[PDB]
Amino acid sequence: EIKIADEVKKSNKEESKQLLEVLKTKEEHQKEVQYEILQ
Amino acid sequence: NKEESKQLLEVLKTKEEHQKEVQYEILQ
Amino acid sequence: GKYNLILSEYLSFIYNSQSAVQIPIYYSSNSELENRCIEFHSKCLENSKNGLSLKKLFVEYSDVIENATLLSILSYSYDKYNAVERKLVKYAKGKPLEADLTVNELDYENNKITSELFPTAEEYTDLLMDPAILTSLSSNLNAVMFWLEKHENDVAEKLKIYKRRLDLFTIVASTVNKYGVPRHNAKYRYEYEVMKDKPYYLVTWANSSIEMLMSVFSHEDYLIARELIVLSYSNRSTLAKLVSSPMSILVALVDINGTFITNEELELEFSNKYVRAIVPDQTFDELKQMLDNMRKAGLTDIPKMIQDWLVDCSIEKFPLMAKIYSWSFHVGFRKQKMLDAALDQLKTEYTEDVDDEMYREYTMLIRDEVVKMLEEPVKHDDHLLQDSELAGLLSMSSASNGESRQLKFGRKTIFSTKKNMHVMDDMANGRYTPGIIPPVNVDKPIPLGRRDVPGRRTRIIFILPYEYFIAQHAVVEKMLIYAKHTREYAEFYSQSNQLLSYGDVTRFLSNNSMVLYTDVSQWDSSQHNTQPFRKGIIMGLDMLANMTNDARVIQTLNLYKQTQINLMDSYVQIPDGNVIKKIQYGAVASGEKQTKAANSIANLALIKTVLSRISNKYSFATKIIRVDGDDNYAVLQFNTEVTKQMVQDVSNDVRETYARMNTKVKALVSTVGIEIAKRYIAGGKIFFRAGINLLNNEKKGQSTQWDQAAVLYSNYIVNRLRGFETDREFILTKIMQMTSVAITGSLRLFPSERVLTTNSTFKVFDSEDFIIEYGTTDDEVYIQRAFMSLSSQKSGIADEIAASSTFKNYVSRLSEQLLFSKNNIVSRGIALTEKAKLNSYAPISLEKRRAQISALLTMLQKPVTFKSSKITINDILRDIKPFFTVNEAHLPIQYQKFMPTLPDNVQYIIQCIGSRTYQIEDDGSKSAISRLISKYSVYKPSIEELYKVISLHENEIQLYLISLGIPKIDADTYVGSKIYSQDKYRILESYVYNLLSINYGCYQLFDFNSPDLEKLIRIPFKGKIPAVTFILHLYAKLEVINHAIKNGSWISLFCNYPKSEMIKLWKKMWNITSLRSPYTNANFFQ
Amino acid sequence: LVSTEAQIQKMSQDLQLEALTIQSETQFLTGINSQAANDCFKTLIAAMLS
Amino acid sequence: LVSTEAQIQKMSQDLQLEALTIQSETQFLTGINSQAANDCFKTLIAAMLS
Amino acid sequence: RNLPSTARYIRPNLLQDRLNLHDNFESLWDTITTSNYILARSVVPDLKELVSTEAQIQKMSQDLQLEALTIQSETQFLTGINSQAANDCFKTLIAAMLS
C-alpha cells in the first residue's frame, strides 16, 4: 500500500518501477530499524 | 615362433642409442 | 524429449500382448488445461478399468497430448512368466561355452557347478559372487535384446557395431540357454535352489560381459571383449592383475614433446620441453615375460596390440593401451574368501639379519616428524587437545563402522554398527569408560573388513572399539592441519578444498633427472610397520608430554600412547567355516583414524633413509618427494646426463637397500612416466583409470532401487570422461527399469524424462550428457515447487529412539560436559542436532527416503499441486532469462590438450578456454562462520542449513552455533563483529556452486575466470547488488558452455538488466527453497 | 561499426551506474542501437538533398 | 578482561565497515579472542626469563 | 676421464650464412625463425615458484576496495592474472628475442 498516484503504480516505464522498488526499500529499512529499537 | 621373438629383442636395441655410453665404451 | 519414446518402445517390446495397455498421464500449469488433464486422466483410468481401446481418446484431447507435460506411464499386464526365454531362444543358436577347471589356482574360484561345491544349502553362500546390486540379470538381457531389436535394420557403421554386439550376445546367450536364467527374489539375492544346478560364477560373468559388449564401438574393442568374455568365464582370479601389469612399464617408454606442470592444487603452466626415454634393457625382458604369461593364459590379439605398438612407442596410438587398461577392470571383482584374501597379506618373513643403523634412523625420523606436527598445539594449550574426548564424541559420525552390537532404546533391539549409538548404549549401563582403553589380544581379538578393488589384492580393515577413535581424533586432526601446508604429503597438500590430483612430477623432469616410483600397498604386514613404527610415535609422545604443563593434554597423549602400546600386540578374528582363527598380527592396517597420515610419515622416513644410500655411489640432489597411500615417488637430479646403466644400477641399489630393511618391492625407475593407483602419466599427459563396474558392485550398500540408478548414471559419466564408453541407451533402459515401481501385481508405473532430469532430491540423469538442465518454463518450476514440498519427511524409528531415556541421558551429559542452566533453550537444540546425525544409521535413512518416494508416487498417480509460492532456482532463472540476447561468435584454439581420453566436445572447450586454476568452497569451509565449526568440531553443516541460518534474526544464529559444540562467548563475538554480513556472499557463492554441479563433473574441469569466456559475456555493471551480478555472470557462462557442449559452436551474450528487476531479485536471493541429491554428483576423481 | 553491446559495456563502466539510485545518466543508453545510426545518417543526407 | 563481543562491537562502530566492499580494516578483527592475549603475555615473559 | 693423444675428433663447419636468407627470402626466413623460436621455448626454464594466484587477488581487491563477489566478474584490472600466462610471457619474450 503505497502513497503515490495510480498512473505511476501502473506505469510500465522503467523509471517508475525503479522508483517504486527504491521506495519499498526505504520503507523496509525504516521498519527494520523501528523493529530493532522495539527489540 | 621364436625367430620373430628374437627379432623383437633385436629391434629394440638399434633404436634409442645413447651417446655418453658409446663414448666411455670406445675409451674402455 | 526423446527418452519417453524409448520408454514407450521398450514397453511395447517387452509386453507385446493384447492385454498389455499403455496409459500416459499429463499435467499443465494452466488451470483450465489442468482440469482437461484431470478429465483425460479419469477417462483413461475408467477405460482401462473396462477393457476399452485407449487409442481413440488420444485424438479428441490432442491439445493435452501436444502442449501439456508428461509425468509417467502406467502398464497393465499380468504375470506372463518366463518371457525372457521366449524372446531369447533366437539369439542363442551358437555353441555354449565350456569351463576349464585347471586355470585358477584354487578349487572354488573355478566356474564349476554349485552342487559340485555346496551339496548342502546349510553351507551354501552366494557371497563369493554376489553382484550386490538391485538390478536383475533378466533386466540386463531384456535391455540388450531390445537394443538389438531396434538396431536390427540400420545399414551403416551402426550395422558394423550391431553385428559385433550380436555375436557377443550370442556367445553369452548360448551359455545361458544351455541351463536357463536364475530368478531374483524380492531382495535381488540368488538363493541355492536356482543356482543348485548351474555354474557358480555365471551371474557375475553375465553382467560383466553384457556391460562390455554394450561398450563396443570398434574392431579392437570387439577383439578385447571377445577375448575377455570367453576367458573370464573360467579364470576369475588372475586376469585383471595380468593385463593391468605391463602398463606400469609402458609409461616409461613414451618420449615427452610438451608437458604440463603444477604449482598449487590445480595450477598449470605448460612447457614445450622435450624429454627422451632412457629405458634400460632388462625391463624389456620383464615386459616380454609378462606378455609370455599373457599368451600362456590364452591371449592372442591383445599381446599383438601391445607388441606392434612398441615399434614406434608413439603417444597417438597409445590411448589403446589406456583403453586396454580400462578393459581389465570391467570383468568383475575377485570376491574370494576372507581367509585366503587375508593370507595375501598375512605372510611374513621376519629376520635377525637386517640393519640396525637403518631402523634407528627410521624410528628417529618418525619421532621428529610427530614432534614437528604437535609441538605448537601441545605447547600453546589448544582447546581441541584439552577437550579431545568431547571432540571425538561429537565427531563419532565421521568414524568407521564398529562391530555389530545389540542395543535397546527403551522397547526395541538394534544391531547398529554406528559408534555414536554404541556410546549412547554404554552410557546408560555404566559401561562408558573412555579412559580404560580395551586390549586387543587373545582374550579379545579384532574383527576384519575387506577393502577390495579389482585387478589388485584385497586389503584388510580393523574394526575396533570406540575408545581408539576418541583417543586418536584430536591429535590426528592437528597432524592433518600440519600436513595441509607440507609439500611432501600428497593426500593433503592443498588450499583447504582440493588435492594434488594432476600430480607434481613434471616440474623437474629432464634429460639429467630421473624419478623412482614405487608401490607400497603390500607394506602392512611388513617388519618396518611393527615395533619401530609404533615406538617412534611413543617416543615422540614422551617428548611432547615433557613439552607441556597442562594435564588434560598429557592425559590425551598418554591415551594415544597406550593405544599405540595395545596395537603393538593385536590379534585378528578370522572365521573358517565354523571354527575361528586368531593370528598374531602386530602391524598396521586401515580401519583407524591414524593409518593415513602415519603411513605417509613412515613411508616418507623410509624413503629418506634409503635415499641416503644411493649417495654412497651416486651424486644427486633430491628435488621432490611425494607419498600418497598406495604409492610414492621421488625425483632426483644429477651432475650430468642420464644413461641406461645408471637407471639400472639405481634400481637394483634401491631394491637391495629396501631388502636390507626386509622390505619387498618392485622398484621402478624412469625419466618421463609413472603409474600409480589413482592416475598415471605418459608423454606429459595425464590419463585415468576407467575401472568402475556398473552392473556389479563391491559390497551391498543400503540405498534403494532408485538411487542406484543415479549412481549408475554418475559412474557412466565418470567412465565416459575416463575413456570407457558404454552405449547410453542401455543406461537409460536400466534407469527406467530401476525407477519402475509395482503398484500391484499387474499395474506398474514408469516415470518420465521431466521427473528424473529435474533438479531435486530425485534427479537421476540429464537429457544431454555433461549438462545439467534448468527450467525456463512454467512446468519445471511447477513440479520443482511441488517436489520441495514433499522432500521433507519423517522417520518414526528416529522419533521413538530420540524419545527414549538413553538419548536424553546422552544429551544431558553432552550439555553438562559443555554448558548448563539452559535446559529448555539450548539443550533442545543439541538434541535436535543429534537427530541430524542419527540419520547416518541406514534404516532411518531408508524409512525417510522410501517415505519421500511413496509421497512422490501418490502424486504421480493423482493430479498435481501448486505448492504455495515456495521460491526455488527456476523461479529466478525464469525472471533472468527474458533479458538475454545471443549472437554467433567464434573463439580460436589456443589452449593445449593434456587429457586426450576426453570426449572431443569437452576437449574442444578445453582447447578453446582454459582448465580450472582455483577451487571455491564446495562445503563452505573457508567461510568465517565455518572456521568456528572447523575449530571446535568437524561437522559439515550443509550449505542449505547455513544459507538459512544467515536469513534468520541475530538471536537464533547463536543457538544454532552453540548447538554444534561451539561455546557462547565466541558466538556472541561473531554476532557482535558483524562478519555474517561479510559472509552472506561466500555462503551464497558456495550454495549456487553446489546446486549446479560446477565442482562436480565436467564443469570441475573448466576455467570460469578465463579472459576468453568473459569477452563473450557482455553484461554491463550496475553495482551495490553483488548477488545479482554474480548469478547473472554465472548463468551466462553456463549458457555459453552448454551451447558449446551440445552444438560445438560458440555464442556471445548481453544482458542490460534493468535496475527494477535487480532489486526485485535481490530480495528473492536469500529465500530460496531448493535442494539437490548427494547421489547425483559424479566426481571425476574417485 | 562498433558493436552496440561492447559500446554499452564501455559507457556503463564510464558512467559508474548504481542499481539503488535514481540516476539521470541511466538514460544515456536509450536507443544506442544500430538501425538508427543508419537511419540518422540516411535522413540527414536525404533531407539536405531534397 | 573486557567483554570480547562488546569491545569488538565497539571496534566495528569505530571502523564504520561496509557490507559491500573488501575493506582491509576487516582483517583487523582477525583473531581478537582471549586465550591468545594470555598466550602472548605468557610467551613474552617466559622467553625473556628463559 | 683423461683422454690420450691417441685420440681424435672431427670439427663441425660453423661458417656463417653464405646465402643471406635475411635478404629477400622472407618465406624461408619465417620458417627458420619459427623453428628457432619453438626450439628456444623448450629450454627457457619453467617458473617453479611464484606467489599464489588467490592470495594475490584478495590483496589486489582490498587495494581496489571492490564490491564483494566481483571476483567472477573480474573488474578489468583482475582479468587474466593466472599463471599459465606468466610463464607464457616469460618464455615468449626470451624465445622471440633469441630467434
Automatic annotation (TrEMBL), chain C:
<dbReference type="InterPro" id="IPR042032">
    <property type="entry name" value="RNA-dir_pol_4-hel_dom"/>
</dbReference>
<dbReference type="InterPro" id="IPR022071">
    <property type="entry name" value="Rotavirus_VP1_C"/>
</dbReference>
<dbReference type="Pfam" id="PF12289">
    <property type="entry name" value="Rotavirus_VP1"/>
</dbReference>
<dbReference type="GO" id="GO:0003968">
    <property type="term" value="F:RNA-directed RNA polymerase activity"/>
</dbReference>
<keyword id="KW-0547">Nucleotide-binding</keyword>
<dbReference type="GO" id="GO:0044423">
    <property type="term" value="C:virion component"/>
</dbReference>
<dbReference type="GO" id="GO:0019079">
    <property type="term" value="P:viral genome replication"/>
</dbReference>
<dbReference type="InterPro" id="IPR043502">
    <property type="entry name" value="DNA/RNA_pol_sf"/>
</dbReference>
<comment type="subunit">
    <text>Interacts with VP3 (Potential). Interacts with VP2; this interaction activates VP1. Interacts with NSP5; this interaction is probably necessary for the formation of functional virus factories. Interacts with NSP2; this interaction is weak.</text>
</comment>
<dbReference type="InterPro" id="IPR007097">
    <property type="entry name" value="RNA-dir_pol_reovirus"/>
</dbReference>
<keyword id="KW-0808">Transferase</keyword>
<keyword id="KW-0693">Viral RNA replication</keyword>
<comment type="similarity">
    <text>Belongs to the reoviridae RNA-directed RNA polymerase family.</text>
</comment>
<protein>
    <recommendedName>
        <fullName>RNA-directed RNA polymerase</fullName>
        <ecNumber>2.7.7.48</ecNumber>
    </recommendedName>
</protein>
<keyword id="KW-0696">RNA-directed RNA polymerase</keyword>
<comment type="subunit">
    <text>Interacts with VP3. Interacts with VP2; this interaction activates VP1. Interacts with NSP5; this interaction is probably necessary for the formation of functional virus factories. Interacts with NSP2; this interaction is weak.</text>
</comment>
<dbReference type="InterPro" id="IPR001795">
    <property type="entry name" value="RNA-dir_pol_luteovirus"/>
</dbReference>
<keyword id="KW-0460">Magnesium</keyword>
<dbReference type="GO" id="GO:0000166">
    <property type="term" value="F:nucleotide binding"/>
</dbReference>
<keyword id="KW-0946">Virion</keyword>
<dbReference type="GO" id="GO:0003723">
    <property type="term" value="F:RNA binding"/>
</dbReference>
<keyword id="KW-0548">Nucleotidyltransferase</keyword>
Automatic annotation (TrEMBL), chain F:
<comment type="subunit">
    <text>Homodecamer; each decamer is made up of two conformers of VP2, called VP2A and VP2B. Interacts with a VP1-VP3 complex. Interacts with the intermediate capsid protein VP6. Interacts with NSP5. Interacts (via N-terminus) with NSP2.</text>
</comment>
<protein>
    <recommendedName>
        <fullName>Inner capsid protein VP2</fullName>
    </recommendedName>
</protein>
<comment type="similarity">
    <text>Belongs to the rotavirus VP2 family.</text>
</comment>
<comment type="function">
    <text>Inner capsid protein that self-assembles to form an icosahedral capsid with a T=2 symmetry, which consists of 120 copies of VP2, with channels at each of its five-fold vertices. This capsid constitutes the innermost concentric layer of the viral mature particle. It encapsidates the polymerase VP1, the capping enzyme VP3 and the genomic dsRNA, thereby defining the core.</text>
</comment>
